[PDB]
Design a protein around this ligand. Sequence first.
Ligand code: 8L4
Ligand code: 8L4
Ligand code: 8L4
Ligand code: 8L4
Ligand code: IMP
Ligand code: IMP
Ligand code: IMP
Ligand code: IMP
Ligand code: K
Ligand code: K
Ligand code: K
Ligand code: K
Lengths: 348, 348, 349, 351
Amino acid sequence: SNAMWESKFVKEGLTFDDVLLVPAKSDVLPREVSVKTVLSESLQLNIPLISAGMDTVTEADMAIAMARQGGLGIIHKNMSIEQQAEQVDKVKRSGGLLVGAAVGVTADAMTRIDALVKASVDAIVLDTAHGHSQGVIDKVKEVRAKYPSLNIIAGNVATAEATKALIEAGANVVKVGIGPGSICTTRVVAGVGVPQLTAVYDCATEARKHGIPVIADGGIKYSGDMVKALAAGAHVVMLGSMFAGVAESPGETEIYQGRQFKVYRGMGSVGAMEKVPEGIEGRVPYKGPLADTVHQLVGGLRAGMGYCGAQDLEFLRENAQFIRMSGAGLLESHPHHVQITKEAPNYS
Amino acid sequence: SNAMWESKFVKEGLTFDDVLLVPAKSDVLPREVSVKTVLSESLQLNIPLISAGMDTVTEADMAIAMARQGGLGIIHKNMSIEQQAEQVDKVKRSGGLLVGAAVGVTADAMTRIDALVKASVDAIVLDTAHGHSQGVIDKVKEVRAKYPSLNIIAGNVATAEATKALIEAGANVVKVGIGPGSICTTRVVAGVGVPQLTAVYDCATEARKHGIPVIADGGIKYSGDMVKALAAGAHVVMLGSMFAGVAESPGETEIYQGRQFKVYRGMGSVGAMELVPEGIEGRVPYKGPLADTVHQLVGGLRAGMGYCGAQDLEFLRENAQFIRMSGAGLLESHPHHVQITKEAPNYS
Amino acid sequence: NAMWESKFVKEGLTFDDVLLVPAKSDVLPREVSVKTVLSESLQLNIPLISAGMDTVTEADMAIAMARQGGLGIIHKNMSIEQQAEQVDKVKRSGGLLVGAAVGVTADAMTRIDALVKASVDAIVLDTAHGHSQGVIDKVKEVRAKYPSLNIIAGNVATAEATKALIEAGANVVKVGIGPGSICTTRVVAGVGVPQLTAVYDCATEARKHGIPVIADGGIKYSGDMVKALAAGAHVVMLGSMFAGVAESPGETEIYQGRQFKVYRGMGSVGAMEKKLVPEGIEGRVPYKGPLADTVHQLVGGLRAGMGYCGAQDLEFLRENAQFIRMSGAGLLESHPHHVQITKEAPNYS
Amino acid sequence: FQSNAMWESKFVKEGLTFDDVLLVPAKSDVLPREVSVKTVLSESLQLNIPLISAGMDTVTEADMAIAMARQGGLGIIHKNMSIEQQAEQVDKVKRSGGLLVGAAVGVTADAMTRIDALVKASVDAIVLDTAHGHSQGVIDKVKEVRAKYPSLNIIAGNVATAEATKALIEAGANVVKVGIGPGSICTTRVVAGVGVPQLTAVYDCATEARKHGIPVIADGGIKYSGDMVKALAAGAHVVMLGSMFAGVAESPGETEIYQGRQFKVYRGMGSVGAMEKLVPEGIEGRVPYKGPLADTVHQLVGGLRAGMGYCGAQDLEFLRENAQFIRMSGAGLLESHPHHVQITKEAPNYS
Ligand SMILES: CC(C)(NC(=O)Nc1ccc(Cl)cc1)c1cccc(C(=N)NO)c1
Ligand SMILES: CC(C)(NC(=O)Nc1ccc(Cl)cc1)c1cccc(C(=N)NO)c1
Ligand SMILES: CC(C)(NC(=O)Nc1ccc(Cl)cc1)c1cccc(C(=N)NO)c1
Ligand SMILES: CC(C)(NC(=O)Nc1ccc(Cl)cc1)c1cccc(C(=N)NO)c1
Ligand SMILES: O=c1[nH]cnc2c1ncn2[C@@H]1O[C@H](COP(=O)(O)O)[C@@H](O)[C@H]1O
Ligand SMILES: O=c1[nH]cnc2c1ncn2[C@@H]1O[C@H](COP(=O)(O)O)[C@@H](O)[C@H]1O
Ligand SMILES: O=c1[nH]cnc2c1ncn2[C@@H]1O[C@H](COP(=O)(O)O)[C@@H](O)[C@H]1O
Ligand SMILES: O=c1[nH]cnc2c1ncn2[C@@H]1O[C@H](COP(=O)(O)O)[C@@H](O)[C@H]1O
Ligand SMILES: [K+]
Ligand SMILES: [K+]
Ligand SMILES: [K+]
Ligand SMILES: [K+]
């Protein structure tokens, strides 16, 4: 019994800023690489980007623009059931685009899920703070029993054991991430978390055994961080802060120092729960149309995949190697000892 | 002999910001967890929080508010014997609440302890800069001889060897912490200390063999640090800076730069002593009623225990696993890359 | 399953992770030799090469570089006729050494012909990713036409890539993916190798063929150069430390009453016009005056480091110098600390 | 093969400095007031406190060496002087009550001429101070001084390795000074890339010197009194301080006022100003005025007594031979300092 006491401090975790991708032999160029991904037979994305289901990130206009760029948007749940079904319905009829919707694990959940399926949603995201809870496992079984063909994205988890549990309950996709969010204070106020790159790797190690894809959710600050998440085993990444400043996102621009900002807050923050916190309320710079951000993101992915000799995302997922570095290595990776004159489209 | 020379740099120590608690399978929700703890046959607490025995944190008005919230207050020793005996009696009169009192290891110590026992004190805290000194060990043995049933809290120590010595001397509770204090300069001016999370774990490993509880004293900056201290083996945590700003603490609010502050200083500082100092004098924001801080602290603990699947503190103490992370992991754990506009009640 | 389980096994070190250990020395800083040979046709008196960037090296910089005992690489953001004119302009000024960068494009061999006609000493087949077959194929195709031409191929960061370019016919391999001061490759693509590990891994392979490597990028102080040479590199390539000298492309600009020079990455938005995704940024460095003053501090720092290590020449430093690893607290100790600096030193700013 | 052994050991060694570690508290029966801080460097050189003021033109002259020795310590008169001035500075300290005093000598052709004038001024120890103590020029000078003066205390430095320590001992040095690059004003590790983290250097050099009965000096990098306790516990007999002494009243240079606060100039002996084209290995700076030396020494020795009590050391030999460290990360360092509290007043030992 003494084993659990002696294993308290054995595990080690890595995050994005701890590693770099090692360049390998390459026969492919960034322009000729493929960035398509399959989450299920009914759900395939042309770019591996999903906008997060938060009240400051994704509504009708964001989900529309995401799908038009080849990605996916998850309409948040901080609205009435009919309002969310009305948002899903807007995205589907506006050219047959893909759309998702967030649902919380509550007694009224199944009523909301039914209304979303009639709007022909492609996937429901049962997103909760702790996916390794029995309430979450049961809700996935109750939805899989009622809708055997519905794409179910279950999260959030950070361990292989939680990944195996949600897969066994009938979830097609597992969303990974406890604590990496830019607006998240879970690790500070509750002390609980797993470094995101290790969380993605540990969960992808289990999901591989079942043919299940995983979503790297939260913590991505630059386009290179997305490449690290995919190379660690993730099929797709979920972004919040990098999308909150975009024009097609809910909320209006506010002025700070002559510059435009958009509100970005955690769904566990005081403000978001009104209509103990595990998030903060803030603002991110205004970034303009989604196409300009998505173009820089995909372009960094194509560059990274060319460096790794990856013709497609599966090759990157199963062959790419990292190298660990210290804090001095992180300062070398960024621009240093030179006064930056202009703001770059991919570096702010 | 050469063994001690070659053993100089073998040990490694971890602090709160080096680790994260791994989320586990959970059948319980934060509202349904138990935060009760037993320190001795005569000492049972409803919340695992003790106010530190400093002239800037806890006097009668603070100890009353602590006990009423389910915790414990330690009346500080910077007083005459007659003043301290009356403070214990004031807290005792207000509904039969639990209260403790700090006593230093000096020739006059037993005279002060006698007056505290007549005021019906529940626990005596034998506070010294170095708990593994022979003068402290002798004082513990003689107080156990004169008062065989009196709760004796002995500290501070940081090693398994020091913990076993105070336990064999007759102390029911051992207080752990050398150098982690927010106002403490021991590790800077004397070079001596042990990282608090390693100190708590090393001492709890020894105290666990005897059924003795340990107190994680100092270094707690956020509610998540308290969850980590308890998951590392501590029954109860002792706070100073997180309590110095509340209304029920000695001293009155001062205005600095148009904002409200309360004085907070170390008991080894120049001001508190009026040897070389091992503390500094400082300032903390006014935080309002004690209940608001206690709610945020306990609420974060309930969240952590729910993330870890702990129904009570013994499950967290015996089963919770940590994961080590780098400074980049710490940067991910905090909010990042978002301009914070509002203050959260648990994150400032 | 090895490839999946080996994802996070490697560890990498950069300049600020290590220090050179002082060794027995009968050598004085003044008496060391800083000469190095890259090929039979390329001998440098100082192991310093100015980078081939449109804000770092043109004719006047290559002239001053060679006159100090080094080498300049004329950048490619110009016409073929302009670059051939820059090479000969440098060559006519006393028969000085000069190189020129050529990208892996359809016109590359057309540009290479014009450079060889100008009596260029080395072409740098410089690409963002040197381990692509387009680069290897281009090296053989250049090696076939010019058996006597010095070919510098980069950039790479692994032992496998060094062996690949050597098999294609490259005399010198340039090492560095992401360490540059103006570089965002590791930020926008997630790809890189810590430069000191990259140099060491490439030198381990390149020594097996007698091939020298160039430590390219990441050098902030003169001591970083000594660490790069002690890690296995024959010569180092500098950009930011040279962009502020008088002999460099661009004109001095005034910022806050002080004089500055533009310094930008060749993968930046501004340099690529001269919607694509950049791998560099546009910046500015303080104006530094004559090139001789910068080189004197650089060579002076190298001479001191070699004296501490007991290396009379650079080959001894390459084969004997020992490092010791340190933490961030060691880096804070290595720099000056707890003292407010009142005057700016020629080597520390 | 042999040629490849040096190539594969390039990145094997690891080094620790003061901010990487903490001293582990041990069983103790002694109190800080009751400990002994006496130390013996040789039979001719015994100090009551283990503190030496550095031989720099902004740290130690006659008035500093006088005040240092009177506190039980030692001052090293710097060498940026003529031979005649340095000998009279030594004589000034000797005439002021027969106090102990040292003098710095560089390894140059004039060295032996300079040393002679110092011995006639009755100096107690000469410091053969060089940027690189493991050079053959330094080894030769120690043998050449040991040949002429068999009883003279010779302090040779600076080194950072066990091999360099053993070489200087074999050349005839009674004391070895350890420190390459840790100085607060030092840029050696930045401009030349060379150094060893000071705590590992002290430990590695004391390991060798212990075998010959030779004491070592921890030179440079000490920012707080706890750094001194760590250096002594890492194997050093005595520590040499510069920045912590450069601000005291009895040190060369005058107090200058900036923004209402009093400052003194503090610069490295490898800075342009002190040597006044060339490549410097130091910078020029400024430190706050600290008042009389007695207040700084009192806080320093007091911090040592506290640490020795935490470690159960009755004297410095017990601390050098028994004290145990524990290693910590950057987060451990932030916990060690005061944190998350706005400091209102300055403590005598902290900032
Ligand atoms: C409501 C709140 C503040 N906290 C929790 O629900 N805590 C929590 C839930 C279950 C367990 Cl077992 C432990 C803790 C929240 C709201 C929205 C998002 C999150 C979030 N951290 N991730 O989605 C959290
Ligand atoms: C008085 C003072 C400044 N120092 C000591 O008493 N030092 C000390 C005592 C015994 C030994 Cl063997 C070694 C050192 C002090 C006062 C109040 C609290 C502390 C403190 N660091 N923790 O409680 C210290
Ligand atoms: C154009 C741009 C921005 N990026 C790339 O060409 N990317 C890239 C090329 C090939 C492969 Cl397989 C993968 C990525 C560039 C331009 C000029 C210089 C560089 C540079 N990093 N080193 O020379 C990069
Ligand atoms: C002159 C100068 C700038 N540099 C050297 O003399 N360098 C040096 C000497 C010998 C060898 Cl083998 C290698 C390097 C200097 C002056 C004063 C002090 C120092 C210093 N670093 N410690 O005392 C250095
Ligand atoms: O307040 C919250 N607490 C914890 N995590 C949150 C909260 N709100 C959103 N998140 C997570 O953070 C992700 C976005 O993180 P980001 O892309 O790094 O800003 C979301 O997709 C959610 O998974
Ligand atoms: O001045 C002192 N020097 C060293 N430690 C102190 C001093 N005063 C209080 N402490 C310790 O610091 C703890 C409070 O630390 P905090 O909760 O981080 O502010 C107290 O409970 C004591 O254990
Ligand atoms: O835009 C770019 N992106 C990435 N690397 C670059 C770029 N421009 C120049 N470099 C590299 O950076 C080196 C100079 O870096 P520096 O010495 O740190 O300033 C050059 O010699 C190139 O190898
Ligand atoms: O300019 C220099 N370069 C390198 N080290 C120096 C220089 N000047 C003084 N030192 C060293 O630094 C020590 C004092 O440094 P500090 O006590 O940390 O400020 C001296 O005793 C010398 O060993
Ligand atoms: K960089
Ligand atoms: K976070
Ligand atoms: K230094
Ligand atoms: K502290």
